[PDB]
């Protein structure tokens, strides 16, 4: 077992070629006599962090050596004005990794039509499934201008078509756009008339955080082609959680940044050459951006679109021009989001609720 | 005969700090005032929380009002906003309204 | 095209550039103008901006203003003046924008006295109006006749006059939630004159019973949450034959008089969570009503609080035929 | 020993209103004693079992002794078998055997391909991926595998050797189910409406049954009593033939009716 006081990095190492297997991780205070600081901070011995195991598992597991910095950069603060410690128990298991679910499928080649659910009453909307949790739960947020604030849960695929809702979550702050995503039983919905990402846990039905995206344009300043205050899109892939936005420093062009789901901070910034208003939608797959360009209702002397014409890698920091055909059966595309578990696209296109199938290559790089 | 003007703050709210879970209240004084209410983190505070005291100052001519609001440790730790727990105060008069300093409870 | 500002196609970007005044070089082919998150004051507004007829949408949120801006573009439909400090509203500043339809004035310092008599009425084409998180003590009098959506929530409103809701016959949604309103503060039949009203919400207020005399001609949604309602009268819900959604949750209700929901035929949903429902002989109508209710109408929230023998239980199902009660 | 096939579940006893929204309570059927084993459920903090001398001491609040468990408990699947507590270990698919008499661990069994830690729990969740049931046949493990596509999988576990003595796969999904209990090697799946689900109005009834001896499934319609909405755990006791149901903050005991319809 390993222990470390606040603002100090913890060192975990397995002998030979073995792998660290985390059993119990608690970032807080259970016993007062452990840390030696000030008695005014040792008064509360009821500090606990449930997310601590999930944080360490992403780093310490599958590796031989891991140095985690026990501070506000990796671990979010549970209670203010209390000195914290990290109690991590671990075993020595062989170097066997789990495939398919965490692994990259390859560089995208074709975006084809999959399922056609219901022709919903709302024109502009979005719908997404929680990839981390192994459940058939379908979230549903229909966007209305200056009136969106209610998330609608569904038990199965059959209950989503027929119209049988499980429960409805009452969101305190108003939603701004169709860029909504769910990550490990929590909603990363964007706030109205602000550049802040509101984190809302579905299990507890209370707000857990709010992160300010630096220099990001908000409230119809730099939305997609159709508009609708879609200035911020939230994509989930094999790498983790991502924020698709636009800054004036990049002259209205698309800016992509990796956001931590626990600490709610930027873990790298990337600038692209494509303009957000020219783009219809965007989705992340293995840290690679896929810009959608499509035809909409009321287009004077235009027919160009229904294609993927821009790609940007985060690991390589290089951009390329592609020509992958995107399906556009209906003109008014609202939201496009990717799910790494099923490897399918969740698309809202002019009232209709549709699902899209994906094709990849035999080599990514 | 009395002069009518916008509310002028005498005792503006100062930044409070919670020590050993002891709840510390905020002070506010304005003139001419008849109704004084707090706006904690962009939203109004309930009437029952406000403790009004319309004490007429011997120095000043117009009516003076003093309202105090308690800020507990539980209200701060459960708050998960972007900025710190800031408190602003608005006073009422026959001509208009005026806003005071943003006192942040940490 | 300005030097400090960087324009893009049919859009002008002056946002977050620390500007104190609107730039001079404005083209005659721009549709949407962005000037938000700056240090632009009410005095720093050139009159050449008024001449630009092509601009229809102007954004000026999160600035340092004091009064409604002057010399704004002549043919503007949507205007955003939120998160600033406008205290005063004038008749002449709204007469210049005759084509104004949508108007947002959120988080501002707008007071009842500061607003000129009939300033909003000057903007004849005004249908959408937003006066949220302001310092309004009451509802203004000079309101547009063709106004469709009036939002005046999260303010300090305690009194509402009968003449305040005059000529607003063409109003659909009316929001007045998050105020210090009471049943004494509301006039006798003030909302009754709004026949086109489809939605009405007064949540997080101090109402001792639902407001008497309400329009049942077009009303579909009626929200009454976090109030101090002790009881609901038989006439309060009568004639509301077109109502679909009703919510009376987070209230202080013990027993409901029978025949109160008898006139709501179109009702698709009812919510009554967190309420001190004292279950005695008075709840025997609720249990039966919930049993033979059609699938189209959902009713949830009814849970027993008193006595301790039946505490926490669900009103939906009875045990031993409500004891010795029948 | 076999009383028969279940006909209807009815309300019988109401003890007290506990401070916890989730948990379970059970009596040892093998030992002829009035000992009541209490279990309060807390997320990522469950590790203590409380013992009570009689029924009167359980209501008033007089605990006999508290056992300190070596590992954290996951879900509300708590069961007692011949003076030994059987529980599910946190973040693992392992039943852990703990003897109450000696106060030390005696074994740990790995349930093959079983989903664990909020992967495949009940309708309310709370890491209730693995539930333990006791009947006339013996000890049983109610779980779910990905091979059966999230559907309920029931297996008979030996209380001494700690090994699987047969595997049975069902058609009902564990996430759709509220609670499960075994009677004479027959599974009883409960479907119920929970709290904060205002959209729901459907009746709470038993709609799925599965026999182990026959290996055949049928669709039934037995009414289940639901005084409250947050049904945490349901367990059967063959000695008293009563259900130990934990509904919301309250702790209740249900009466059972049996029929002669059985081969
Ligand atoms: C690639 C990968 O993530 N491998 C494993 C994962 O399968 C496992 O779930 C996690 C903790 O259990 O440790 C890691
Ligand atoms: C529990 C508590 O602190 N109550 C305080 C009271 O002591 C104080 O005198 C009053 C001043 O308005 O505000 C309230
Ligand atoms: C501008 C306008 O139409 N004003 C009308 C007025 O003419 C009418 O007499 C009154 C009746 O209540 O309602 C108002
Ligand atoms: Ca997307
Ligand atoms: Ca059970
Ligand atoms: Na999205
Ligand atoms: Na059990």
Residue numbers in the entry:
A (entry chain C): 100 to 464
B (entry chain A): 46 to 151
C (entry chain B): 36 to 361
D (entry chain D): 202 to 464
What do the authors say?
Here we focus on three structurally distinct cell surface receptors: the fibronectin-leucine-rich transmembrane (FLRT) proteins, the Latrophilins (ADGRL, Lphn, Lec) and the uncoordinated-5 (Unc5 and Unc-5) receptors. Most protein–protein interactions shown for FLRT involve the LRR domain, which promotes cell adhesion via interaction with itself (homophilic)2 or with Latrophilin7, and triggers cell repulsion by binding Unc5 receptors. We find that while FLRT2–Latrophilin3 and FLRT2–Unc5D complexes consist of 1:1 dimers, complexes of FLRT2, Unc5D and Latrophilin3 ectodomains form large assemblies containing two copies of Latrophilin3 for each copy of FLRT2 and Unc5D. Taken together, our data reveal unexpected structural versatility for the interaction between three different types of cell surface receptors: the homophilic adhesion molecule FLRT; the repulsive guidance receptor Unc5; and the adhesion GPCR Latrophilin.
We expressed and purified mouse Lphn3Lec-Olf, mouse FLRT2LRR and rat Unc5D Ig domain 1 (Unc5DIg) using HEK293 cells, mixed the proteins in a 1:1:1 molar ratio and crystallized the resulting complex. The crystals diffracted up to 6 Å maximum resolution. The resulting structure revealed an unexpected stoichiometry, in which each copy of FLRT2LRR binds one copy of Unc5DIg and two copies of Lphn3Lec–Olf. Each asymmetric unit contains three such 1:1:2 ‘tetramers'. Within each tetramer, Unc5DIg is bound to FLRT2LRR in the same orientation as the 1:1 complex structure we solved previously (root mean squared deviation is 0.7 Å for 423 aligned Cα atoms). The Olf domain of one Lphn3Lec–Olf molecule (Lphn3ALec–Olf) occupies a binding site on the concave surface of FLRT2LRR, which has previously been identified as the FLRT2 dimerization surface. The Olf domain of the second copy of Lphn3Lec–Olf (labelled Lphn3BLec–Olf) makes extensive contacts with the Olf and Lec domains of Lphn3ALec–Olf and inserts a negatively charged loop (S393-N405) into a cleft formed by FLRT2LRR and Lphn3ALec–Olf. We termed this loop the ‘DDD loop' as it contains three consecutive aspartate residues: D397, D398 and D399. The DDD loop was unresolved in our previous high-resolution crystal structures of Lphn3Lec–Olf alone, suggesting that it only becomes ordered on engagement with FLRT2LRR/Lphn3A as found in the complex. The lectin domain of Lphn3BLec–Olf makes no contacts with the complex and its electron density is not visible in the map.
